[PDB]
Write an enzyme that holds these catalytic residues in place. Structure first.
Site, PDB file in Angstrom:
ATOM      1  N   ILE A 135       3.731   0.052  -7.383  1.00 23.63           N
ATOM      2  CA  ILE A 135       3.657   0.638  -8.727  1.00 23.63           C
ATOM      3  C   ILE A 135       2.341   0.316  -9.455  1.00 23.63           C
TER       4      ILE A 135
ATOM      5  N   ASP B 143      -5.497  -2.068   6.613  1.00 21.66           N
ATOM      6  CA  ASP B 143      -5.002  -0.847   5.974  1.00 21.66           C
ATOM      7  C   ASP B 143      -6.213  -0.017   5.583  1.00 21.66           C
ATOM      8  OD1 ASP B 143      -3.617   1.168   4.729  1.00 21.66           O
ATOM      9  OD2 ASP B 143      -2.899  -0.060   3.054  1.00 21.66           O
TER      10      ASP B 143
ATOM     11  N   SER C  11       0.798   5.711  -9.434  1.00 24.43           N
ATOM     12  CA  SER C  11       1.326   5.668  -8.065  1.00 24.43           C
ATOM     13  C   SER C  11       2.648   4.895  -7.992  1.00 24.43           C
ATOM     14  CB  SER C  11       0.301   5.036  -7.126  1.00 24.43           C
ATOM     15  OG  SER C  11      -0.851   5.849  -7.031  1.00 24.43           O
TER      16      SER C  11
END
Lengths: 169, 224
Positions: free
Chosen positions: B23, B132, B20
């Site tokens: 990083i 989140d 991803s």
């Protein structure tokens, strides 16, 4: 006795050996290049080895506090920034029946006999089965300040909690 | 190349595999011990601390913190999750949900979903926050034939007793499930809620009250 390297640090080999029936702790302690670690506070290799890592990372990327890497790992093994306290609680005592013999530096032969020269005790394999005879949980919980609500299924459960503590230095 | 700097950092000794960005990597090499692992490079210090605290809460499932270099911003976390059979993808909740979307009337999905809420109930009862809570940040670990939910990337996470914060997290989640636009989206959230309530409804009269407060706030936030 195990010689090992940490992946990120191939330039540095480290030697650990475990001893039973040590009859001269005080002889050693008093008349002290190794680090003599009290295995009542180590329960796993995952623990010991993470603290070695942290040691190196610390000397490579941050700052070195103690005289050598042997000391620094004793320091890094502990969950405290105070040196004298880490030495004291993680180093051998005068009542030490077992110890972990450690050093940083290729000569397996000379080591095995430099150690047994120092330690009037019986060497045994540095591995988890052996380490989990001599760790003292209640003592660990004291030193590593663990809630009594924390109740792990096994030694891995315990180990993890100490790796966490060792790593958040 | 950023990869160049990373690679140089862990040396050739450590195989990495980018995963991803903006990083993360994978590696089958353990940072200090003689299968697969996770490396985050970058804030992180936050995520580490949290993960430690969260582990210690009984019942709460989260990644193991394996190693942490705070001076360069590296954290090796345990690897959670596998691949759904039949190419349905990596076993986070989104994918699980898409997978079972046409056939949602089973224990597997409902009890897997209540479990999810158990985790959030847990998280919030201890006055912690994810911040989140997307359906992509809940990965499922295989336990026999059941599934076991865990929570991940606590980068934007915090510790809070502000009831509004608990409502936002719930909202982010319920919103993400509604994002897909499934017919069955409403049920999922009901079921996740059940498991949340189940958890509070356990901690007694204290629980019911504190629960009642978060319930009302959430309704309000959903309303705003």
């Amino acid at each position: 006795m195990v010689v090992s390297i940490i992946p990120q640090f191939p330039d540095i080999k480290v030697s650990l050996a475990l001893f039973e029936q040590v009859k001269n702790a005080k002889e050693i302690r008093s008349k002290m290049s190794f680090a003599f670690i009290d295995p009542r506070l180590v329960c796993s290799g995952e623990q010991m080895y993470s603290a070695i890592y942290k040691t190196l990372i610390e000397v490579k990327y941050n700052k070195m506090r103690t005289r050598n890497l042997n000391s620094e790992c004793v320091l890094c093994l502990s969950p405290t920034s105070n040196i004298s306290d880490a030495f004291l609680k993680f180093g051998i005592k005068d009542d030490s029946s077992q110890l972990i013999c450690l050093k940083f530096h290729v000569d397996k032969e000379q080591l095995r006999t430099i150690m047994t020269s120092i330690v009037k005790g019986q060497e045994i394999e540095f591995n988890d089965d052996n380490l989990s005879r001599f760790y003292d949980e209640a003592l660990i919980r004291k030193i590593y300040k663990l809630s009594d609500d924390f109740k792990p299924q096994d030694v891995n459960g315990l180990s993890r909690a100490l790796v966490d503590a060792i790593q958040l230095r | 190349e950023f990869i160049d700097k990373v690679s140089s950092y862990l040396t050739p000794d450590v195989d990495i595999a980018p995963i991803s960005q903006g990083i993360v990597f994978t590696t089958t090499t353990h940072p200090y011990l003689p299968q697969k692992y996770i490396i985050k490079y970058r804030r992180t210090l936050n995520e580490s601390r949290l993960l430690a605290k969260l582990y210690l809460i009984p019942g709460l499932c989260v990644p193991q913190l394996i190693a942490c270099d705070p001076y360069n911003g590296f954290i090796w976390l345990e690897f959670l999750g596998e691949d759904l059979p039949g190419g349905h993808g990596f076993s986070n909740l989104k994918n699980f949900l898409w997978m079972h979307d046409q056939d949602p009337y089973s224990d597997l999905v409902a009890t897997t979903l209540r479990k999810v809420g158990r985790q959030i109930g847990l998280l919030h009862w201890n006055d912690y926050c994810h911040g989140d809570l997307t359906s992509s940040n809940i990965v499922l670990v295989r336990d026999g034939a059941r599934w076991t939910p865990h929570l991940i990337d606590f980068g934007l996470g915090s510790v809070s007793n502000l009831v509004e914060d608990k409502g936002v997290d719930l909202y982010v989640l319920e919103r993400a499930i509604l994002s897909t636009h499934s017919k069955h989206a409403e049920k999922y959230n009901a079921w996740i809620m059940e498991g949340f309530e189940e958890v509070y409804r356990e901690q007694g009269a204290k629980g019911a009250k504190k629960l009642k407060e978060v319930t009302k706030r959430f309704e309000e936030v959903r309303l705003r």
